[PDB]
Design a protein around this nucleic acid. Structure first.
Lengths: 144, 62, 67, 19, 142, 141, 56, 191, 100, 75
RNA sequence: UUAAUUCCGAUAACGAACGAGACUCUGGCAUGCUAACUAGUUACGCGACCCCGGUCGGCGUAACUUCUUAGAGGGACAAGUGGCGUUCAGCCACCCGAGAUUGAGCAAUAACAGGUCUGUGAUGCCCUUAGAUGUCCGGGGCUGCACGCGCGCUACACUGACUGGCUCAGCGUGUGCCUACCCUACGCCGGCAGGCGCGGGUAACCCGUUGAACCCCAUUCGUGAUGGGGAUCGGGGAUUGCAAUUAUUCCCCAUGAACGAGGAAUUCCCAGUAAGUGCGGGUCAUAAGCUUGCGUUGAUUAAGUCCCUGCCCUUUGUACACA
């Protein structure tokens, strides 16, 4: 029970991401860029997965199915207000984003507002504070 | 050198730069008659005990 | 830091000077006689004067108190 | 009086009145 | 049987506790609960100290209710440990030999005076130019 | 003779929650698996069958003090709204969770929405609560 | 029992002066000021400027 | 128990303060025999009122320090209770006796200070009062256990047990005895 | 008969003399009196800065204003207590006679 | 400088040490066992809870902050 | 000698006045006093539940004022004893006692070219006075960011973070003159911020027994820039408003920066004090990282001095006196 089982997946891979087996599974799957502690715990709930185990001890079929859970939210009865991309301008579909998909959409959205010449995009080009912060005495390590 | 007990008999005056050391007349518990003057840190009371590392050296009275 | 002022000492000395006949060694007896003989507008000052009267008159008995 | 204001506001009202 | 009740109070801070001593068997209760279920459990013996000093034999004849209000946890525990101790002493001064009352009072007041006499300390008022009673804001030169 | 105040109030919630899980006729909502219990919280309950623990807690609070609404239950289950870099403040509990727990304890004949607003405790409930208090006293004796 | 009249402002020139006229027994501190000392302050309009009057 | 007042479950009597000098400023026996470290206080009322506080309460007071733990005496009382359990296991003595020994062994005898012939300056050696001895003894072994526990698996209760065992021994391993010997050395170096 | 006389005043000894006067008047007119129930004093507190400018040390003024409330309940037909309460009025206190 | 890498689960010989050694210690705490076997506090607690329920070590006090066991008596 | 030009002593001074003190408010004490259906308690009758008792902030009316309220007096004075002292003034310790220095308010003669003309329909002179420096209207700015300062908030974790459970406050405030905007219980809807419904309250009456946080108990974590920390950034949703982009505020998911206890230098502070902790008042359509108050948890050190920085006095010297 407490001695290291054979095929203890020390170094797992979930969407080209080197995840640790030594960390507990709920706090281990949050290494992916687009899932936090909140989204991790609710997905490891939705897939009937015992979260008393480490990420070395779970089975490969359970890693596969829970990756299908993470990409497919509404096929497993998860709320629409839980997602990090809700009612997009292009597809109008409320859809969760994972590892590299975030960096894709983030790069697109910054270039988007930059080319349509919104003041928000202009501050993002100048690399200033954009949500209307006072920069008289803040953000100095930014510009040396 | 053997560590020896001096007993405070009469507190005299306060000394140091910032008035930090109590200068006290001690009467030796070992020898009947020998009474010397010693500078002492912290708060000291009339009629209690000190453990002197040397029982020969004496502090300059003011 | 309990030093009595001129008003306490003067008025206490005047009451000892005049009414030595009734004043005593007990605090509460001469507090009442002091209240009766003297018009003191506050109660704290009454207790202060009576308190001094029954300290001087505890020393008049001893010997040559000056004032 | 059906306007029925607080005794607090009533006394500061009387205060400014005299003032 | 007639009335043998004395309502006696114990304050340590804002908090107050009125112990209702009465004739009967040995039971002590605080807001319905008994003594050994009044948290915090850390100060268990603070409620028991009057019991363990006097024994359970002196509380054979009395059944002391306690109603408590105000203050916080530690103040309330110091309020009630004082209240029941005064409540028994006031019972033994009214209905029993004063030699018994005298013996109990001497037993307690030697262990701890805080059992019968209230702590006269109260949270001091704040003054401006400072975050508390005495503390002042940081002064800057140049 | 035993009542609820004679026993340790910590293990009494465990005992009732265990009894109410055994009954298992408690109209438990379907968002239980995905919900956060108050806006001031960061995570979801570590325990997986928390609803029956809160149902036990609500029921014994209606035992001690009757006439409680849901706004009283949002208050009583308040904590620290730890505001990152700004100072901490007090925040209430969730309305929906407290309301549906009271309504689950109403779906079962254990509470009774009394006059002058709020929920009181029903004779069946007080009988239930005092009997399991006797069971808890027996177990710890 | 005692009086105090102090009129301040510019006299005989441009620099501001303060004349104080006082006699008898006058108390300043304590509580008795609230029911022994009657005080009033007024302004007088002259052609060069304002002078202030404090009677006590 | 109308006769003996076991401190939680530790005996009052059969604990002896061997040193004559620190005997008055250490309260463990016969009248300072109380069940809890916790109490009201009023030991900051007058000058030498402090000497009458049970040494266990003095330790409980000194422990709660470094800002974030100012006024958590309940948490400190549970630390002292757990420490007394652990001392009894590893040692097998009366934990109150081990504490009393650690207080004696940790307190310095001589310290360096600035004195006079006012004009220039001079750093000579002077004695420490029997109150100052016990005051600094408590502070040293409290801060020793504190800084040992910081960024470590060894819990504050275990670190306190370590310091009080090694200091009662006179090891030079406890921060208490290490620092004592540093101060007495400097005190010698300029006497 | 059950009639409620409340007295709201900023000054205390004024209010006390009115409370005394209504007990005197009541016990003379031979009617049952409920003694002067003392509701808690309300302290209206306003704390401002002293300086008109802001070029001084930060000193504040603490202005207080106490307001006291007594009430006596009597068992009397309106008339006799109305004529008791129509005499001996001073500027400090204020009267309310409530029937129901 | 230096770093600490404790075990999340027992090596065979580390569990062999635990099954042989930790019931010989006078003080048994998850922190002591964590240092003495190069194991995370989670493993330490789970292992000592096995040892107790098994019926080998005598527990003295439990608390959320501090859980203390000792070696069982001899006679 | 004292907190003190506070006193008693020496004494060509005696007697006094202002400031200190006294004074007003405040905190602690009364089983003594006057009172209570806008405050309770105890007993009682009833009602509900556990096995005669027990619990009830479940219901209801004869006694009383312990707890709450606020009026009148009382009480404490270095008064008792033991020391020290010119034997004085007073200081140290100890009994008894609710206190053996609670904290504020006020505040002298004389002055400063200190601040305010942007508080005033206090106000001299000057300016301007129709294309206004008057005033209204609509837009932006008061926040702009290679930079250097000052006041604060959150952290650097295991004396801890997270998740449950258990349990306790005190100051207040609350529906408006022109003035519109109040405090909210309770029943349904929504995960959440919110929406709709009927109510109480001009307030010891209703929000309310103000179920506050820290703390406490039980778990998960395990020395890893980690479940520490939450800056920066993306997306959606509510509320306030006539209007939020240069995000008002708040909520939900995602992003996870430095920071491993801090150089020279420097600040505040001695008892319910420092500090931790949250709750009210101000501003307020919206609204606290500020400030002004309040309670809860609650110490280490000291009862000393002129070494440091200041200010204050006496002696002495002077060719200074717009010094």
């Amino acid at each position: 029970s407490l001695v290291i089982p054979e095929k203890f997946q020390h170094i797992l891979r979930v969407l080209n991401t080197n995840i640790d087996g030594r960390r507990k599974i709920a706090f281990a799957i949050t290494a992916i860029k687009g899932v936090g502690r909140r989204y991790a715990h609710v997905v490891l709930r939705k897939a009937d997965i015992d979260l008393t185990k480490r990420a070395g001890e779970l089975t490969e079929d359970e890693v596969e199915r829970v990756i299908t859970i993470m990409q497919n939210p509404r096929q497993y009865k998860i709320p629409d207000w839980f997602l990090n991309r809700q009612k997009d301008v292009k597809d109008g579909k409320y859809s969760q984003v994972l590892a590299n998909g975030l960096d894709n959409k983030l790069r697109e959205d910054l270039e988007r507002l930059k080319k349509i010449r919104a003041h928000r995009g202009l501050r993002h080009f100048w690399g200033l504070r954009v949500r209307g912060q006072h920069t008289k005495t803040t953000g100095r390590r930014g510009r040396t | 050198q053997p560590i020896k007990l001096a007993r405070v008999t009469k507190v005299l005056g306060r000394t140091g730069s910032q008035g930090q050391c109590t200068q006290v007349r001690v009467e030796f518990m070992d020898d009947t008659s020998r009474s010397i003057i010693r500078n002492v840190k912290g708060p000291v009371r009339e009629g209690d005990v000190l453990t002197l590392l040397e029982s020969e050296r004496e502090a300059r009275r003011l | 830091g309990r030093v009595r002022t001129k008003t306490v000492k003067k008025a206490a000395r005047v009451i000892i000077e005049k009414y030595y006949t009734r004043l005593g060694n007990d605090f509460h007896t001469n507090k009442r006689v002091c209240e009766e003989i003297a018009i003191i507008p506050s109660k704290k000052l009454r207790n202060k004067i009576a308190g001094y009267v029954t300290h001087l008159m505890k020393r008049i008995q001893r010997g040559p108190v000056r004032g | 009086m059906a306007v029925q204001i607080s005794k607090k506001r009533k006394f500061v009202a009387d205060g400014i009145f005299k003032a | 049987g007639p009335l043998q009740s004395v309502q006696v109070f114990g304050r340590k801070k804002t908090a107050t506790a009125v112990a209702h001593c009465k004739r009967g068997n040995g039971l002590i209760k605080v807001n319905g609960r008994p003594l050994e279920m009044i948290e915090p459990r850390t100060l268990q013996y603070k409620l028991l100290e009057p019991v363990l000093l006097l024994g359970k034999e002196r509380f054979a004849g009395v059944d002391i209710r306690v109603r408590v209000k105000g203050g916080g946890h530690v103040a309330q525990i110091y309020a009630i440990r004082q209240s029941i101790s005064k409540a028994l002493v006031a019972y033994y001064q009214k209905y029993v030999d004063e030699a018994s009352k005298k013996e109990i009072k001497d037993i307690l007041i030697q262990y701890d005076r805080t059992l019968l006499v209230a702590d006269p300390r109260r949270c001091e008022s704040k003054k401006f130019g400072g975050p508390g009673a005495r503390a002042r804001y940081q002064k800057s030169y140049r | 003779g035993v009542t609820v105040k004679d026993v340790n109030q910590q293990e009494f919630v465990r005992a009732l929650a265990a009894f109410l899980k055994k009954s298992g006729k408690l109209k438990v909502p379907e968002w239980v698996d995905t919900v956060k219990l108050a806006k001031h919280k960061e995570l979801a309950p570590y325990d997986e069958n928390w609803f029956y623990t809160r149902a036990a807690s609500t029921a014994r609070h209606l035992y001690l003090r009757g006439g409680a609404g849901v706004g009283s239950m949002t208050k009583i289950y308040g904590g620290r709204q730890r505001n990152g870099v700004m100072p901490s403040h007090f925040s209430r509990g969730s309305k929906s969770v407290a309301r549906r727990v009271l309504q689950a304890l109403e779906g079962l004949k254990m509470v009774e929405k009394d006059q002058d607003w709020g929920r009181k405790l029903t004779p069946q409930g007080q009988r239930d609560l005092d009997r399991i208090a006797g069971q808890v006293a027996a177990a710890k004796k | 029992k005692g009086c105090e009249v102090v009129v301040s402002g510019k006299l005989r020139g441009q620099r501001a002066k303060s004349m104080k006229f006082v006699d008898g027994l006058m108390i300043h501190s304590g509580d008795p000021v609230n029911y022994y000392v009657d005080t009033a302050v007024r302004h007088v309009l002259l052609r060069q400027g304002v002078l202030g009057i404090k009677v006590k | 128990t109308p006769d003996i007042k076991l401190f939680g479950k530790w005996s009052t009597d059969d604990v002896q303060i061997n040193d004559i000098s620190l005997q008055d400023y250490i309260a463990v026996k016969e009248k300072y025999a109380k069940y809890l470290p916790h109490s009201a206080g009023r030991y900051a009322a007058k000058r030498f009122r402090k000497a009458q506080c049970p040494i266990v309460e003095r330790l409980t007071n000194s422990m709660m320090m470094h800002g974030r733990n100012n006024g958590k005496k309940l948490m400190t009382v549970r630390i002292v209770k757990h420490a007394f359990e652990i001392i009894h296991l590893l040692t097998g003595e009366n934990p109150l006796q081990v504490l009393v020994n650690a207080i004696i062994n940790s307190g310095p005898r001589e310290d360096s200070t600035r004195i006079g012939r006012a004009g220039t300056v001079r750093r000579q050696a002077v004695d420490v009062s029997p109150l100052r001895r016990v005051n600094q003894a408590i502070w040293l072994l409290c801060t020793g256990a504190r800084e040992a526990a910081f960024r470590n698996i060894k819990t504050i209760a275990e670190c306190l047990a370590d310091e009080l065992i090694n200091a009662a021994k006179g090891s030079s391993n406890s921060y208490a005895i290490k620092k004592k010997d540093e101060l007495e050395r400097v005190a010698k170096s300029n006497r | 008969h059950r009639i409620r006389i409340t007295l709201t005043s900023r000054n205390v000894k004024s209010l006390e003399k009115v409370c005394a006067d209504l007990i005197r008047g009541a016990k003379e007119k031979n009617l049952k009196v409920k003694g002067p129930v003392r509701m808690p004093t309300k302290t209206l507190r306003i704390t401002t800065r002293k300086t008109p400018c802001g070029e001084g040390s930060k000193t504040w003024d603490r202005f207080q204003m106490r307001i006291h409330k007594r009430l006596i309940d009597l068992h009397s037909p309106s008339e006799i207590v109305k004529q008791i309460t129509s005499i001996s009025i001073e500027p400090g206190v204020e009267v309310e006679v409530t029937i129901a | 400088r230096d770093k600490l890498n404790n075990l999340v689960l027992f090596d065979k010989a580390t569990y062999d040490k635990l099954c042989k050694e930790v019931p010989n210690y006078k003080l048994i705490t998850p922190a002591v066992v964590s240092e003495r076997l190069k194991i995370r506090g989670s493993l330490a607690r789970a292992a000592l809870q096995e040892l107790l329920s098994k019926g080998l070590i005598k527990l003295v006090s439990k608390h959320r902050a501090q859980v203390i066991y000792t070696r069982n008596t001899k006679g």
